[PDB]
Design an enzyme around this catalytic site. Structure first.
Site, PDB file in Angstrom:
ATOM      1  N   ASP A 140      33.424  37.487  46.018  1.00  0.00           N
ATOM      2  CA  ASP A 140      34.124  36.993  44.826  1.00  0.00           C
ATOM      3  C   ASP A 140      34.876  38.109  44.056  1.00  0.00           C
ATOM      4  O   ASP A 140      35.203  37.941  42.873  1.00  0.00           O
ATOM      5  CB  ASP A 140      33.124  36.284  43.905  1.00  0.00           C
ATOM      6  CG  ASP A 140      33.790  35.353  42.888  1.00  0.00           C
ATOM      7  OD1 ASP A 140      34.965  34.960  43.080  1.00  0.00           O
ATOM      8  OD2 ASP A 140      33.129  34.990  41.897  1.00  0.00           O
ATOM      9  N   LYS A 143      40.887  39.429  45.945  1.00  0.00           N
ATOM     10  CA  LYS A 143      41.155  38.548  47.069  1.00  0.00           C
ATOM     11  C   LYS A 143      41.725  39.295  48.272  1.00  0.00           C
ATOM     12  O   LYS A 143      41.456  38.900  49.411  1.00  0.00           O
ATOM     13  CB  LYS A 143      42.061  37.391  46.618  1.00  0.00           C
ATOM     14  CG  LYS A 143      41.560  36.668  45.334  1.00  0.00           C
ATOM     15  CD  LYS A 143      40.026  36.396  45.336  1.00  0.00           C
ATOM     16  CE  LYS A 143      39.449  36.078  43.955  1.00  0.00           C
ATOM     17  NZ  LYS A 143      37.940  36.183  43.918  1.00  0.00           N
ATOM     18  N   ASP A 168      34.425  32.589  47.680  1.00  0.00           N
ATOM     19  CA  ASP A 168      35.007  31.842  46.562  1.00  0.00           C
ATOM     20  C   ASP A 168      36.531  31.955  46.635  1.00  0.00           C
ATOM     21  O   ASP A 168      37.068  32.948  47.162  1.00  0.00           O
ATOM     22  CB  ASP A 168      34.544  32.422  45.200  1.00  0.00           C
ATOM     23  CG  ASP A 168      34.838  31.486  44.019  1.00  0.00           C
ATOM     24  OD1 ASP A 168      34.888  30.263  44.247  1.00  0.00           O
ATOM     25  OD2 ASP A 168      35.010  31.955  42.863  1.00  0.00           O
ATOM     26  N   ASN A 169      37.211  30.950  46.091  1.00  0.00           N
ATOM     27  CA  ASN A 169      38.623  31.082  45.724  1.00  0.00           C
ATOM     28  C   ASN A 169      39.586  30.982  46.906  1.00  0.00           C
ATOM     29  O   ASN A 169      40.667  31.590  46.875  1.00  0.00           O
ATOM     30  CB  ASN A 169      38.855  32.404  44.953  1.00  0.00           C
ATOM     31  CG  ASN A 169      38.254  32.387  43.553  1.00  0.00           C
ATOM     32  OD1 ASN A 169      37.510  33.296  43.169  1.00  0.00           O
ATOM     33  ND2 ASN A 169      38.608  31.370  42.769  1.00  0.00           N
ATOM     34  N   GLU A 198      36.665  26.962  38.383  1.00  0.00           N
ATOM     35  CA  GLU A 198      35.775  27.083  37.243  1.00  0.00           C
ATOM     36  C   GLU A 198      36.429  26.649  35.921  1.00  0.00           C
ATOM     37  O   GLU A 198      37.489  27.148  35.552  1.00  0.00           O
ATOM     38  CB  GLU A 198      35.239  28.523  37.132  1.00  0.00           C
ATOM     39  CG  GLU A 198      36.299  29.633  37.141  1.00  0.00           C
ATOM     40  CD  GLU A 198      36.478  30.313  38.496  1.00  0.00           C
ATOM     41  OE1 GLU A 198      36.390  29.623  39.544  1.00  0.00           O
ATOM     42  OE2 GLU A 198      36.734  31.541  38.507  1.00  0.00           O
TER      43      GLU A 198
HETATM   44  C1  LIG Z   1      46.144  30.366  40.599  1.00  0.00           C
HETATM   45  C2  LIG Z   1      44.969  31.034  39.954  1.00  0.00           C
HETATM   46  C3  LIG Z   1      44.920  32.431  39.808  1.00  0.00           C
HETATM   47  C4  LIG Z   1      43.826  33.067  39.211  1.00  0.00           C
HETATM   48  C5  LIG Z   1      42.734  32.325  38.753  1.00  0.00           C
HETATM   49  C6  LIG Z   1      41.558  32.985  38.102  1.00  0.00           C
HETATM   50  C7  LIG Z   1      40.501  33.578  38.985  1.00  0.00           C
HETATM   51  C8  LIG Z   1      39.465  32.741  39.406  1.00  0.00           C
HETATM   52  C9  LIG Z   1      38.437  33.224  40.206  1.00  0.00           C
HETATM   53  O1  LIG Z   1      37.440  32.344  40.585  1.00  0.00           O
HETATM   54  C10 LIG Z   1      38.423  34.584  40.603  1.00  0.00           C
HETATM   55  O2  LIG Z   1      37.338  34.898  41.400  1.00  0.00           O
HETATM   56  C11 LIG Z   1      39.464  35.440  40.173  1.00  0.00           C
HETATM   57  C12 LIG Z   1      39.491  36.867  40.605  1.00  0.00           C
HETATM   58  O3  LIG Z   1      40.559  37.497  40.745  1.00  0.00           O
HETATM   59  N1  LIG Z   1      38.352  37.550  40.872  1.00  0.00           N
HETATM   60  C13 LIG Z   1      38.453  38.968  41.118  1.00  0.00           C
HETATM   61  C14 LIG Z   1      37.138  39.620  40.839  1.00  0.00           C
HETATM   62  C15 LIG Z   1      37.006  40.829  40.298  1.00  0.00           C
HETATM   63  C16 LIG Z   1      35.640  41.355  40.046  1.00  0.00           C
HETATM   64  O4  LIG Z   1      35.142  42.165  41.119  1.00  0.00           O
HETATM   65  C17 LIG Z   1      35.319  43.556  40.787  1.00  0.00           C
HETATM   66  N2  LIG Z   1      35.916  44.209  41.915  1.00  0.00           N
HETATM   67  C18 LIG Z   1      37.253  44.101  42.402  1.00  0.00           C
HETATM   68  N3  LIG Z   1      37.448  44.735  43.559  1.00  0.00           N
HETATM   69  C19 LIG Z   1      36.197  45.326  43.866  1.00  0.00           C
HETATM   70  C20 LIG Z   1      35.730  46.151  44.949  1.00  0.00           C
HETATM   71  N4  LIG Z   1      36.583  46.493  45.965  1.00  0.00           N
HETATM   72  N5  LIG Z   1      34.415  46.577  44.956  1.00  0.00           N
HETATM   73  C21 LIG Z   1      33.611  46.196  43.928  1.00  0.00           C
HETATM   74  N6  LIG Z   1      33.910  45.442  42.840  1.00  0.00           N
HETATM   75  C22 LIG Z   1      35.215  45.019  42.826  1.00  0.00           C
HETATM   76  C23 LIG Z   1      36.145  43.579  39.458  1.00  0.00           C
HETATM   77  O5  LIG Z   1      35.813  44.773  38.809  1.00  0.00           O
HETATM   78  C24 LIG Z   1      35.633  42.268  38.817  1.00  0.00           C
HETATM   79  O6  LIG Z   1      34.300  42.406  38.360  1.00  0.00           O
HETATM   80  C25 LIG Z   1      40.507  34.925  39.369  1.00  0.00           C
HETATM   81  C26 LIG Z   1      42.770  30.931  38.911  1.00  0.00           C
HETATM   82  C27 LIG Z   1      43.870  30.294  39.497  1.00  0.00           C
HETATM   83 CL   LIG Z   2      32.571  24.352  36.394  1.00  0.00          CL
HETATM   84 CL   LIG Z   3      30.373  34.836  38.758  1.00  0.00          CL
HETATM   85 MG   LIG Z   4      36.049  33.660  41.960  1.00  0.00          MG
END
Ligand SMILES: Cc1ccc(Cc2cc(O)c(O)c(C(=O)NC/C=C/[C@H]3O[C@@H](n4cnc5c(N)ncnc54)[C@H](O)[C@@H]3O)c2)cc1
Ligand SMILES: [Cl-]
Ligand SMILES: [Cl-]
Ligand SMILES: [Mg+2]
EC number: 2.1.1.6
Length: 216
Positions: A140, A143, A168-169, A198
């Site tokens: 998660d 992406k 997820d996603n 979510e």
């Molecule tokens: C169209 C659309 C776009 C966006 C959304 C919204 C939306 C909905 C969702 O469910 C999503 O999961 C996301 C999303 O981008 N999640 C990214 C999550 C990052 C977390 O993980 C951390 N991280 C990032 N790279 C690493 C890595 N290599 N090693 C360790 N930790 C890492 C960061 O430090 C954060 O803690 C966004 C909804 C709809």
């Molecule tokens: Cl929900």
């Molecule tokens: Cl979460």
């Molecule tokens: Mg997510």
């Protein structure tokens, strides 16, 4: 002053019961339904996570991306005694909020948070942290990391026949390079779990990809 993430933790501390993981999750879901949206996996996708954990009863689980510790609490609370969750989180502010969230919940002894980029950490797991093979991975984080880390996990030998990947996603934001690979490769067997993003009415889903072994 405070960030959204500190506001989520604060709201939990005031409104949920300490040592109770279900009030902790309901509190985060309430805050994100009525006050501020945040990228927690959520209840609807959460129940799919519950069932997956229930079906396989994993002894070692790895979580890529902790954020506020909502999936961590969600999975940790369902683990059988002796089982562990490693979680990798590249942001220290998130890593710190996650730790405190697990403490409040009373699940800190089932979870080992490693603060750093997953691509640096996955290679260290066997040597530094004693690992043989993972029984489950939950993706998660960013992406664009799903596929290179899925391949780095294979490369490193952390996967075994029967290891469950849960991602997820896969519809929104979407994970195209990852989804086309796992659905195309004879090294995985996949099932799609359709759901909602979510705290929204927008169709999302999770993908379950069970590792079959290295391709001949
Ligand atoms: C169209 C659309 C776009 C966006 C959304 C919204 C939306 C909905 C969702 O469910 C999503 O999961 C996301 C999303 O981008 N999640 C990214 C999550 C990052 C977390 O993980 C951390 N991280 C990032 N790279 C690493 C890595 N290599 N090693 C360790 N930790 C890492 C960061 O430090 C954060 O803690 C966004 C909804 C709809
Ligand atoms: Cl929900
Ligand atoms: Cl979460
Ligand atoms: Mg997510």
């Amino acid at each position: 002053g405070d960030t959204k993430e500190q506001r989520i933790l604060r709201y939990v501390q005031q409104n949920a019961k300490p040592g109770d993981p279900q009030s902790v999750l309901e509190a985060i879901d309430t805050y994100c339904t009525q006050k501020e949206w945040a990228m927690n996996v959520g209840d609807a996708k959460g129940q799919i996570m519950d069932a997956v954990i229930r079906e396989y009863s994993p002894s070692l689980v790895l979580e890529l991306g902790a954020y506020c510790g909502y999936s961590a609490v969600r999975m940790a609370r369902l683990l059988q005694p002796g089982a562990r969750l490693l979680t990798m989180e590249i942001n220290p502010d998130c890593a710190a909020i996650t730790q405190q969230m697990l403490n409040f919940a009373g699940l800190q002894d089932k979870v080992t948070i490693l603060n750093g980029a997953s691509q640096d950490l996955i290679p260290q797991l066997k040597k530094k942290y004693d690992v043989d093979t993972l029984d489950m991975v939950f993706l998660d984080h960013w992406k664009d990391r799903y596929l290179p880390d899925t391949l780095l996990l294979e490369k490193c030998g952390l996967l075994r026949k029967g290891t469950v990947l849960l991602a997820d996603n896969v519809i929104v934001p979407g994970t195209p390079d990852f989804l086309a690979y796992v659905r195309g490769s004879s090294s995985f067997e996949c099932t799609h779990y359709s759901s909602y993003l979510e705290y929204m009415k927008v169709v999302d889903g999770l993908e379950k990809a069970i590792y079959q072994g290295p391709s001949s």
